[PDB]
Every structure is written in C-alpha cells, then in structure tokens.
C-alpha cells in the first residue's frame, strides 16, 4: 500500500531485501524478482531462483546477484552499476515449500544523476570521500577498503581498510594517511564513506573504493584536486 522508496545515483549499487524470517530451515522453494517501469505495463524477470540455482536475466544478467542465503530463507537481490533505465518498481515473490506465497512490498527505484566523481579540496582542510551501497537490508556490507594512487603511482596505497572479521580495535589506515583518514559512514548501514582531515598538496590523486557484499565487489573512483590558497 506504500512502496519503500530507494534513490541511488547512476552507476551505484542497490541491494533490495527479500527475507522471510531467517531460520536454520530452508522453506524457500522459489524466489522471483520482477521489474516494471510502471503499472499498466509489462514486467520482466531480473532474476529467478529455484532448486539451488539462480538465473540472472535480461539487462540485469551481468549486474544482478542473489546475495541472501536462500538456505536461510533470505532471497535478497543485489543490483550493481545501476542505470537510469533501471528506474522503476522491483518486486520480490517467494514461494514457500508449504506452498503459501510471500510477496514483499514493491520497491520504487529512483535513479538520480551521476555522482560528481571529481573532488576539489583546499590544502589544510578536511574533505569527505563518500562510498556506499544502499539497501533495504542492513549489515550486508562485509568489507571496505580505500586505495590511493596518484596518476604517477605505479603502485597502490591503503588509505583505509575495514572488515567484518577484524582482529583489530579499529580500521586499518597505513602510512601517510595515518591519523588523518577517518570513517564518516556507518559500515553497518552499508556506508563506507570516509573523511580526510588535514589535506596536503601531495594527497592529490585517484582514490578507489572497493566495497564488498560477500565475494561481490562494487568499485568507485574519485579524483582529488588539492589547491593552495
């Protein structure tokens, strides 16, 4: 009666939840994800699952992934690299082994224009470099690491590394970036956005965010311009 609504920028990743209460008992028989632009108009399968084999299809072939453990009645969908064309209604239908069906509220996906992708910081100031996937379901992001590389660099540098299975008291930030890099996102809410505290001329370069939902990685890239005033 009221569609959860989800706004994401072109190119970003969305995770669209679909869980019947997670139990240690697989009751999920089938999982179907349908896409529609409006009503009054045909739908197409993003992805359908049955008997421990999922079929990503259509334009979503390369970009759609069944992320939820279906053996735990979690049939959540992860749509990568969202286009404007993907703007519409997404509907999850799970058929239970007891033969009842569970339809989840269709979710309106509103696709916004492309992120800036070109950041301009002023020396000796703080800036933010944001990176996050958006989902109706929390705590799906299993790992986040930011890699820095000046166009010159035949090399990579860890800006900030944070993982679900950390045997540390905090995120890992190496070298130069120590003491300055800091997390502005709530990774539990699938938000890996970071903050750079006291920017120096040498910080200039390309920052790459690799944000993981299991094995599945989504990658962003931000060019940082530093300026002396």
């Amino acid at each position, epitope marked *: 009666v009221s569609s959860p609504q989800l706004r994401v920028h072109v190119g970003e990743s969305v995770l669209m939840g679909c869980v019947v*209460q*997670r*139990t*240690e008992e697989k009751h999920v028989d089938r999982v179907d994800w349908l896409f529609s632009k409006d009503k009054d108009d045909a739908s197409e399968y993003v992805l359908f699952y049955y008997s421990n084999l999922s079929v990503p299809t259509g334009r979503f072939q390369n970009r759609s992934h069944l992320v939820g*453990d279906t053996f*735990h009645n979690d049939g959540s969908l992860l749509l990568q690299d969202v286009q404007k064309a993907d703007e519409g209604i997404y509907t999850c239908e799970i058929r239970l082994k007891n033969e009842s069906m569970v339809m989840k509220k269709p979710v309106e996906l509103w696709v916004l224009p492309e992120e800036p992708r070109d950041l301009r910081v002023r020396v000796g100031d703080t800036t933010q470099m944001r990176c996050s996937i958006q989902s109706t379901e*929390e*705590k799906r992001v*299993t790992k986040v690491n930011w890699m820095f590389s000046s166009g010159s660099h035949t090399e990579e540098e860890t800006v900030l590394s*944070y*993982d*679900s*299975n*950390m*045997r*540390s*008291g*905090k995120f890992q930030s190496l070298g130069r970036f120590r003491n300055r890099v800091d*997390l502005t996102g*709530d*990774i*539990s809410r699938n938000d890996g956005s970071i903050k750079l505290q006291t920017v120096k001329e040498s910080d200039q370069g390309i920052y790459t965010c690799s944000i993981y939902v*299991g094995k599945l990685e989504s990658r962003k890239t931000i060019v940082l311009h530093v300026v002396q005033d």
Partner: antibody
Amino acid sequence: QVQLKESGPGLLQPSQTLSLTCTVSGISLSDYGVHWVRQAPGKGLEWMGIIGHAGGTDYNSNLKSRVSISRDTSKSQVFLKLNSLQQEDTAMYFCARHFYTYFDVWGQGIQVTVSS
Amino acid sequence: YTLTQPPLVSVALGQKATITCSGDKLSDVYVHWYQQKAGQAPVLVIYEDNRRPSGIPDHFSGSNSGNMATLTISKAQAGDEADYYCQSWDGTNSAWVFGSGTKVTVLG
C-alpha cells in the same frame, strides 16, 4: 530471525569439565566469528575467547589452556569447553556474534553453577 | 584487565547522565557501549565511539577523546536504569576488553 542460543549443564562439581554449545540460527558460521563471554555473579563481563569465521581461535591470557573453543558448521554450532572447574567458573555464559569490531548480537545466556 | 568506569551514576528523570570509560591510549581504538538489565543479555547501545543502532533511543550518544570515552544519556528515562559496560580492544595482547561497569540509577 538471527539468533544465538546457548545450552548445556547447569550444575557441575569441581575438577569436572564444562562444555557449552551455542546454536547460531539464521546465518552461517563461514563468514562470522563467534565470541564466548562470561559474567561472574559479583564481577562484570569477561571475554574468554573467539572462534573466527575462518575457524581460527584466540583466547584470554588468564584463561590459558583450560579453555577450548571449537565448532561444527554443518550444525551451525559453536562449542565452549572449560577445564579444571573451580569456584567462580560459576557465571552467566554468553555467546555473541562478532561484527567488525564489536558484539552486535548476543545470546540469552546460560547460568552455570559449579558446586559440590 | 578492565577499563576504568565509575561504580554508580545517578540521574533524575529527564536529566543528563554521563558515563566515562578510561583506557591507555583508548582514543586510538573504537569504543563500544552495552546495556544490561536484571538477568538479561547485554545489548549494544553505542558502537564505534559515536554511533547508534536503530532501535536504541535517540537520546543516547557517545564520544571518545583524550583517552576517555563517554556514554551520554540525555533526557534520562526510567527504562534507562541499567548496567552499562564500555568495551574495546587491547592492542598489546590481542584481546577484546570490557569496562568495570557502571550502574545507572534513575531518580525522580
């Protein structure tokens, strides 16, 4: 319905061996490490050890070599085993999920008296 | 090993309450707070120094500076009357460590 529920004997004599079991429902142990934490009547929370998602284990220095944590992924079951039961092994025993750098989800806990 | 924590902290209804948590170089590592009531399992109320799970009341907030964390219970209710343990990570040994614990009593 993500749940941790512990289970085992409520009463034990000294010099016996405790063995608890924590049943992690709604998820898989293959990608989350589970903690064991206890709380003695008077005192606070004491971390005993962890079994990481990868099956690796670390323990509490004080609890050195009479604590033992293993698991069975097939059952989604994480076990604790305590040796040389003395007094004030008497405590509430909790198993908790390890998310990033904290304990997001906890068990209901289990009271375990060690008495003659 | 335990992080220093005041035994008891009182507070009238609606009053502000502040629970401190001290540790060596505590502010180079995340600190988290748990709530525990009568014969109940602990519940995470604050995590990562300064964040809050949905389901926890807005009037909870945390900070971590000068090697001293502080759980703030603004606008204290009677349902906040509980035991609060901070928690962290010892990077000498490789272990997770809790605080001594604080009993928050709600007066008025």
